[PDB]
Amino acid sequence: SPTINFINFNQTGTCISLGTSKGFKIFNCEPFGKFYSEDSGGYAIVEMLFSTSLLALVGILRIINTKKHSIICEVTFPTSILSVKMNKSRLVVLLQEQIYIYDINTMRLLHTIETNPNPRGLMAMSPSVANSYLVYPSPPKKNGDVIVFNLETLQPTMVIEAHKGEIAAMAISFDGTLMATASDKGTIIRVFDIETGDKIYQFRRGTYATRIYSISFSEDSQYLAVTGSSKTVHIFKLGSRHFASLKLPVETNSHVMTISSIGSPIDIDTSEYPELFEEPVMKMVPIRVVSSDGYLYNFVMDPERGGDCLILSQYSILM
Amino acid sequence: SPTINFINFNQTGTCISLGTSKGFKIFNCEPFGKFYSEDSGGYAIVEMLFSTSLLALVGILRIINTKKHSIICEVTFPTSILSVKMNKSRLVVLLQEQIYIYDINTMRLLHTIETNPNPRGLMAMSPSVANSYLVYPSPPKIKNGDVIVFNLETLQPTMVIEAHKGEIAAMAISFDGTLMATASDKGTIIRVFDIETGDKIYQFRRGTYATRIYSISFSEDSQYLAVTGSSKTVHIFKLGHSRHFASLKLPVETNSHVMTISSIGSPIDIDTSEYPELHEPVMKMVPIRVVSSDGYLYNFVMDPERGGDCLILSQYSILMD
Amino acid sequence: SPTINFINFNQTGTCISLGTSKGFKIFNCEPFGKFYSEDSGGYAIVEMLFSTSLLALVGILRIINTKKHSIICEVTFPTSILSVKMNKSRLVVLLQEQIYIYDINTMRLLHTIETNPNPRGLMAMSPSVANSYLVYPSPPKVIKNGDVIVFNLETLQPTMVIEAHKGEIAAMAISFDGTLMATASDKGTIIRVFDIETGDKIYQFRRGTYATRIYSISFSEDSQYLAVTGSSKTVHIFKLGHSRHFASLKLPVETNSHVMTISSIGSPIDIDTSEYPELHEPVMKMVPIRVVSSDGYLYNFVMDPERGGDCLILSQYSILM
Amino acid sequence: SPTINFINFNQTGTCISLGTSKGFKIFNCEPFGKFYSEDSGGYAIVEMLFSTSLLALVGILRIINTKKHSIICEVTFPTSILSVKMNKSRLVVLLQEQIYIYDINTMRLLHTIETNPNPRGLMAMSPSVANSYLVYPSPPKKNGDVIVFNLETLQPTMVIEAHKGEIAAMAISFDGTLMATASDKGTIIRVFDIETGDKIYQFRRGTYATRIYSISFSEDSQYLAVTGSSKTVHIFKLGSRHFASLKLPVETNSHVMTISSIGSPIDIDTSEYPELFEEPVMKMVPIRVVSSDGYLYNFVMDPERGGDCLILSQYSILM
């Protein structure tokens, strides 16, 4: 079982992108299966578009098409690549102190932003081309300043004073309307309107010092998912206190990094699961949590009650 | 330590077959020892009969007699072999969409079944010639968990079992060919059907959340049924008649990403003086042997009355020695 | 992931110093962060004062101010340095057979002590100027092997000789105010704490069940608890509010057993029981414990001062990442 | 902590030779301390004489002197070296199908024995020059036949039908008078007299299938210790049922191979250990068990009561 180096969903949360020290793999979420794999070598970042057989490979930057098994182009950077995100219009590569913006169609360079250092490789992109924005932190060389950069016209739009301390995680909704950020102490969540900059929502989490790792919106932006180092995942409703919580089984490895993504509500069959969770079918919002130890976890929450969420399944990546 | 690709007991559970990336090995169970080995190359499938020095080897089909060190015959197929099972009467080869049946004696081809694709290479075959039966899944081209009961003696299907709503994940047949147990890909419900009539006899619930199942195996006396899954835990269901009767927990050090196959042996006498079971000097303990894909063997004991969590006595290594 | 050769807290326990084979790093504890780092070379001793941007760096002795990025001084020694400690008044450098004491401000040499060889580089420094004491072991030169010398840094004259243990001393620790001293023999079975001004042994603790090595000892800020870590991969807490260890810290099973582990005890803080099912008032004070190991991980625990017992683990970071 | 590859006592049981994937180490037993170490490379076989600064090095054969830091000689063999043993007069190298015998002084080759294949690299050699005997199994090409070879005159002396099954472990006492064997069943231990060949003692062990790994004689030959895969070590008295037993603590790793060596009886201080085992001092026979995980253990047995033995210390090798 080779060690993995990168794990991430796609822009819709219906796939798993995973790259090991020996190769990379592409999974699925509801009809679980191994769509693709190559045992080429160590891969540090494997990012995928909205399916469409498009991938970006970063060695432990190359763009490949898995259907045609060809290589579109290769680009080098003076420093190590820290993060890559994509939408249907723009390609952005983030480095230690520079942000590169590319046209996803032509591959031509469009603009380069000189930013203050980002050791954590933090950026967030709106995946919809209707409101194509880019947000990145602006530390002073006034700590949690986030630069709302408009990729459509290649000009910044406004600067938001998000938090007094360092920003830990940022995410943009699917429609590109809202932005959410979390401070380095990981106790307060702030959600901003990217158009005006007003603070709309504030959430409490992490009663003790548990750092926040990842934040993700649902497809309809109804729910917000935050994963930290406490092996517990909180759910906040964008309709204060958390709405629902996820408790991973204790037997799991604790030396893991966990991300999450919330999908559209689906129907689950009671007869399939006799012991737990026992109306043949109920509407339950699916939550998918993948950890670096190589396991995909599926949880479901009742849209009215909330509370601690059951685990329907636990599948094994890398096998 | 070479990577191993295949582990299977014999049809009686008294031997161990195994295949590495460099060759294959054959062990024994009660007087543990390495009967045979061969450093040829990558072996994917190593199947053995009831001892008798007959082997089937599939590289990563050739049948070899190990006592004579000779080759009986070699059979080629258009596609890769996914499973091979034997009894003392018939030889069965499964491809992803085709099933081949051979006579073990004369080795002439007897039948061929064109089946819907089986990417998992699932099968269950009765090892006794008195009740020689073959069962394989029949997915459509909700009618997903249909299993075809095929009689090997006359080479004709007998009945169609509407086993499960979803795809079948694992299937096994008792030693006498009387019963069959299947499980869906969710691994939450274990069902047992009588192959003679087709009526469902037993239905067991396994675990709480849906997790993958690796293999199912009956006892030699058909008293208990063993299931192994991704939970790093092995459950035992008592068929003397729901919830599992007794469960097997591997040591916490064991890697969780390991394939595990198990087998249940006949009850034998153990000394309670040496082992503080927590007392008569000796009581009959049912032995269970569990081998993992990392290369270790585990010996447990089960109390037919008490059941519960089973104590572990010893542990070996199958790689090296 | 480069190998790390040295980890220690500051004299207050709110910071982290660390030395790799490629450089050194400085962290923080409550609002966790990386204050400083340089990829200069191999570092074996990285000791810091009470913040104040003052460091002692020994290659695999140089005093560097991290805020100014300048060099206060550079001093050489005939042999390799084994330990360095500071308070806001004095600086101590220990070689295998010699002890050098420097004034922290003027940096001129004040005293030199010729001691019997200490290959283990063991000392203990009181961080308060009111009770500035240094203690070092004095074994006979080749039963009375565990003799330790209580040395006063203020007047540069020894005060008394303590017959600590029968065997060689393995670890020493002085409380924040310089009132108490704790010692550990090479067998690690008995922990003894002495009152430095009077010399009487106040408390005696039994550690574990069998003899095993001890890595380090450290007091709490308020001298309420004493923390010892040993090769059994278990950390014990002894309550000095007054035998058997009061509370025990069990690291996760997946952790390597061959890890140097140092710990520290912080002041009690308010934690929300709604988030953490301790097993209930919304908030209760729980003493936080930070345990950093040589593999490069930090572990946060909480102890209930009344209940004590086995401690729950809240979170785990990863130093060097 | 680099993985170790080889553990062995010296011919007297007062020293520890250990080989890592990075180098080799030489420990001591009663004043436990690190005598020597070298970070040269992987070593698979490290054998030491009765102190005397003599070592045998086999790569993962070189004879080196640790005090002079020089090499005595280097000899190669057609096949991989399986085992090496020494006394004060002879040097023995065993391959799969051959046994090489050397004069430890002149380094000249003396004799070569053609044997049936021994994949386990099994032997037993008498450490005393007065009765210098060598034994090695002789399987057919009648399974447990062992050839008693006289190293003094370089001629075999007698053949004993030890066991009906394959031989698993052999050991010879310090004075070279007695011999011990164990079959692959691990249930029967038989002790032979080399002079005559008669079966002297027979001991019962291993009620279930636990293979026997190593057998060792005490210095006075009063006790015989056998170690298996069951995490338990039994003690037999050469004055049926085992005399005493060693139970390692449960928290230890189970993927361990333990060897043992019983030393001369010594006195222990009861005051040093208040928490366990509570006369100021009493005579107790020390037993040393080192495992492949890197831990050394010291047990003590009361020569009259026997029974389960207490554990005094657990020191961490390799650290």
Q: What secondary structure letter does DSSP report for C178?
A: S
Angle at C302 between CA C296 and CA C307, to 5 degrees: 145
The residue of chain D with its CA nearest to that of B301 is: D208
Q: Which long-range contacts (CB under 8 A, 24 or more apart) does B192-195 make?
A: B192/B225, B192/B239, B193/B161, B193/B163, B195/B126, B195/B131, B195/B133, B195/B135, B195/B149, B195/B158
Nearest-angstrom CA–CA distance, A139 and A117 = 7
**Does residue D271 sit in helix, strand or coil?**
helix
Q: Taken in order C270, C271, C273, C279, is the CA torsion positive or negative? A: negative
> What is the number of other CB atoms lying within 10 angstroms of the CB of residue B12?
16
Decide if C15 contacts C26 (C-beta within 8 A).
yes
State how far residue A261 is from chain B, nearest Cα, in angstroms: 20
Residues in chain D that come right before a backbone break, where C and next N are over 2.5 Å apart = 60, 141, 239, 278
Q: Note whether A touches D: 3 CB pairs or more under 8 A.
A: no
- Chain A: give the shortest CA distance to residue C272, in Å: 5
Judged on CB neighbours under 10 Å (0-12, 13-18, 19+), D38 is: middle
Q: Does C3 touch chain D (CB under 8 A)?
A: no
* Chain A residues close to B254, C-beta within 8 Å: none
Phi, psi of B307 (to 5 degrees): 65, -130
State both tokens at D280: 């100021």
> Which residue is closest to B273 within chain D, CA to CA?
D207
| Sequence-separated (6 or more) residues with CB below 8 Å from residue D110 | D90, D101, D102, D103, D154
Count CB atoms within 10 A of the CB of residue C316.
Answer: 19
A118 to chain C: which residues are within 8 Å by CB? none
* Resolution of the experimentally solved model in angstroms: 3.8
For tokens 């009689």, name the residue: B151
D245 → chain B, closest CA residue = B274
Residue C63 to residue C40: CA distance in whole angstroms: 14
Q: How far is C212 from chain D (nearest CA, A)?
A: 5
Kindly report the nearest CA distance between residue D188 and chain B, in angstroms: 13
Q: Please give the full DSSP string across C46-92, using - where no structure is assigned.
A: EEEESEEEEEEEEE--EEEETTTTEEEEE---SS---EEEE-SSEEE
Listed residue (B71, B73, B107, B70) closest to B92, CA to CA: B107
Contact B234, B224 (CB under 8 A): no
C-proximal residues of A, 97-156, CB under 8 Å = 119
Query: How far is the C-alpha of B148 from the C-alpha of A230, rounded, in Å?
Result: 49
Interface test with B, best of A34, A256, A272 (most B CBs within 10 A): A272
Cβ of residue D229 closer than 8 Å to a chain B Cβ: yes
* Residue D88 DSSP SS3: coil
Cα gap B52→B105, rounded to integer Å: 13
Which chain C residue has its CA at the smallest distance from A210's CA? C315
- CB contacts, 8 Å: C257 with chain D: 253, 293
Question: What would the two tokens of residue A117 be?
Answer: 């250092």
The CA distance from C259 to the nearest CA of chain A, in Å, is 16
Chain A CB contacts of C274 below 8 Å:
207
Do residues D288 and D29 touch, judged by C-beta distance below 8 A?
Answer: yes
E strands along B165-265, which residues? 168-173, 179-184, 189-194, 200-205, 213-218, 224-229, 233-238, 246-249, 260-264
B101: nearest Cα among B71, B64, B75, B80 = B75
Quick one: DSSP state of residue C3?
-
Quote the CA–CA distance of C225 and C244 in Å, as a whole number. 13
Q: Is the dihedral of CA B235, B236, B238, B239 positive or negative?
A: positive
**Which residues make beta-bridge pairs with C16?**
C9, C27
- Residues linked to residue C147 through DSSP beta bridges, in sequence order: C163
Give me the residue label for tokens 């192959």: B195
Count Cβ atoms below 10 Å from residue A60 Cβ, excluding itself: 12
Find the Cα–Cα–Cα–Cα dihedral D215, D218, D220, D224, rounded to 10°: -50
DSSP code of residue A179: E
DSSP-assigned beta bridge partners for residue A281: A269
Nearest to C4 by CA among C27, C21, C16, C17: C21
CA pair distance A150, A240, nearest whole angstrom: 31
Collapsing DSSP to helix, strand or coil, C294 comes out as coil
Query: What distance in Å separates the CA atoms of residue D44 and residue D39, rounded to the nearest whole number?
Result: 14
User: CA-to-CA distance for D298 and B148, rounded, in angstroms?
Assistant: 63
Task: Judge whether A254 and A269 are in contact, CB under 8 Å.
Answer: no
The token pair that represents B20 in the structure block: 């590495």
CA distance B247 to A286: 30
CA distance A20 to A35: 16
| B310 within 8 A of B302, measured Cβ to Cβ | yes
Which of C57-87 are b and which e, b meaning 16 or more Cβ less than 10 Å from the residue's Cβ? Answer: bbeebebbebeeeeeeeeeeeeeebbbbbbb
CA nearest neighbour of B31 among D187, C115, D204, C130: D187
Nearest Cα residue to C104 out of C124, C114, C89, C93 = C89
- Residue labelled with tokens 């990392």: B294
Give the Cα separation of A287 and D146 in Å (integer): 67
Cα–Cα distance, A291 to C292 (Å, whole number)? 23
State the best of B34, B285, B315, B318 to mutate against chain D, taking most chain D CBs within 10 Å: B315
The alpha-carbon gap from B83 to the nearest alpha carbon of chain A, in Å, equals 19
Rounded Cα gap, residues B171 and A269, in angstroms: 23
CB count within 10 Å of CB A62 equals 15
Three-state secondary-structure class, residue C258: coil
Residue B205 sits at the chain A interface (C-beta within 8 Å): yes
Residue A313 sits at the chain B interface (C-beta within 8 Å): yes
- Radius of gyration for chain D, computed over Cα atoms and rounded to the nearest angstrom: 19
A285 contacts A294 by C-beta, under 8 angstroms: no
End-to-end CA distance of chain B: 11
Sort out which chain B residues have CB atoms less than 8 A from D184's CB and list them: 31-33
Do residues A186 and A167 make contact, with C-beta atoms less than 8 angstroms apart? no
* B·D CB contacts under 8 A: 33
Report how far residue C118's alpha carbon sits from residue C93's, in angstroms, rounded to the nearest whole number.
13
D184 in contact with B, Cβ within 8 Å: yes
Size of interface C-D (CB pairs under 8 A): 48
Q: DSSP for D218-266? A: -TTSSEEEEEESSSEEEEEE-----SEEEE--TTS-SS--EEEEE---E
Residue B31 to chain D, least CA–CA distance (Å):
6
Please list the alpha-helical segments (H only) found in chain A.
none
| Nearest-CB residue to C315 (from A119, A166, A229) | A229
Task: Mark yes or no for CB contact D316/C256 under 8 Å.
Answer: no
Backbone angles phi, psi at A49, to 5 degrees: -85, -165
Across the interface, whether the CB atoms of C315 and A211 are under 8 A apart is answered yes
Q: Do chains A and B touch (3 or more CB pairs under 8 A)?
A: yes
Contact A310 B209 (CB under 8 A): yes
From residue D86, alpha-carbon distances to C23, D54, D65, D104 in Å are: 47, 10, 15, 8
Task: Decide: D74 and D84 in contact? Cβ < 8 Å.
Answer: no
Which residues are within 8 A (CB) of B236 and not within 5 positions of it... i.e. 6 or more apart? B224, B225, B226, B244, B245, B246, B247, B248, B264, B288, B302, B307
Nearest to C49 by CA among C63, C34, C35: C63
Render D192-212 in DSSP notation, one character per residue: EETTT--EEEEEE--SSS--E
Cα B113 from Cα B92, distance rounded (Å): 11
Residue at D312: amino acid letter: L
Yes or no, beta carbons of D275 and C167 under 8 Å apart = no
Q: Is B299 on the interface with D (CB under 8 A)?
A: yes
| Residues B73 and B63: beta-carbon distance below 8 Å | yes
Q: Could you tell me which of D203, D219, D197 has the C-alpha nearest to residue D127?
A: D219
Using CA atoms, how far apart are residues D291 and D312, in angstroms rounded to an integer? 16
The whole-angstrom separation of Cα B145 and Cα B162 is 6
In terms of C-beta density within 10 A (0-12 exposed, 13-18 middle, 19 or more buried), how is residue A13 classed?
buried
> What does the block give as tokens for C71?
């060099």
Say if the Cβ atoms of D210 and B314 lie within 8 Å: yes
**What is the CA B148 to chain-centroid distance, rounded?**
19
Q: What angle do CA C94, C98, C100 make, to 5 degrees?
A: 60
Are A104 and A65 spatial neighbours (Cβ–Cβ below 8 Å)?
Answer: no
Place of tokens 């009152």: C195
3-state secondary structure of B131: helix
* The pair of three-digit structure tokens given for residue D228, joined into one six-digit string: 């298996």
CA–chain centroid gap for B272, Å, is 31
| Cα–Cα distance measured from residue D67 to residue D80, given in angstroms and rounded to the nearest whole number | 28
Tell whether the torsion through CA atoms of D34, D38, D41 and D46 is positive or negative: negative
**C314 and A230: CB-CB below 8 Å?**
yes
C250 interfaces chain D, CB cutoff of 8 Å: no
The tokens of C150 are what? 């209580």
DSSP-assigned beta bridge partners for residue C17 = C8, C26
Token match 């600067």: residue? A159
Neighbours of chain D (3+ CB pairs under 8 A): B, C
How far is C260 from chain D, CA to nearest CA, in Å? 9
Q: What is the C-alpha radius of gyration for chain B, rounded to an integer number of angstroms?
A: 19
d(CA D246, CA D233): 5
What distance in Å separates residue C94's CA from the closest CA in chain A?
38
Contact B41, B71 (CB under 8 A): no
For residue A66, give the nearest of A57, A58, A55, A50 by alpha carbon: A55
Q: Does D21 touch chain C (CB under 8 A)?
A: no
B130 three-state secondary structure: helix
- The answer to whether D159 touches D138, Cβ cutoff 8 Å, is yes
- DSSP classification of residue C153: T
Give which of D43, D41, D37, D82 is closest to D60, Cα–Cα.
D43
CA angle B252, B257, B258 (to 5 degrees): 85
β-pair type (A124-125, A133-137): antiparallel
Q: What 8-state DSSP symbol labels residue A3? A: P
Q: How far is B293 from chain A (nearest CA, A)?
A: 11
CA atoms within 13 A on the CB side of C95: 12
Identify all chain B residues contacting A275, using CB atoms and an 8 Å cutoff.
188, 205, 207-208
Q: Which residue in the set A166, A208, A229 is minimally distant from C317, CB to CB?
A: A229
Angle at D246 between CA D241 and CA D249, to 5 degrees: 145
Please give the single-letter amino acid code of residue B234.
V
CB-nearest partner of C254 from A229, A230, A253: A253
Query: Is C272 within 8 Å of A208 (Cβ atoms)?
Result: yes
Q: Measured between CB atoms, does A186 come within 8 Å of chain C?
A: no
Q: State the number of CA atoms in the 13 A half-sphere of D131 facing the CB.
A: 14
Contact A313 B166 (CB under 8 A): no
Query: What Å distances lie between residue D316 and A98, A221, C213, D27, D32, CA to CA?
Result: 49, 55, 8, 11, 10
Report which secondary-structure segment, H or E, holds A98. Answer: strand A98-103
Residues from chain B contacting residue A314 (CB–CB below 8 Å): 209, 211, 230
At residue D130, what is the residue type?
Answer: A
Give SS3 for D274.
Answer: coil
Q: What are phi and psi of B116, to 5 degrees?
A: -65, 155
Q: What is the DSSP annotation of D281-317? A: EEEEEEEEEEETTSEEEEEEE-TTT-EEPEEEEEEET
Longest dimension (CA), chain C: 62
Distances (CA, A) of C47 to C27, C83, C135, C262: 13, 9, 18, 14
For residues A123 and A167, give the distance between their C-alpha atoms in angstroms, rounded to a whole number: 11
What Å distances lie between residue D115 and A151, B146, D96, D134, CA to CA?
A: 80, 60, 8, 13
Nearest to B94 by CA among B61, B64, B131: B61
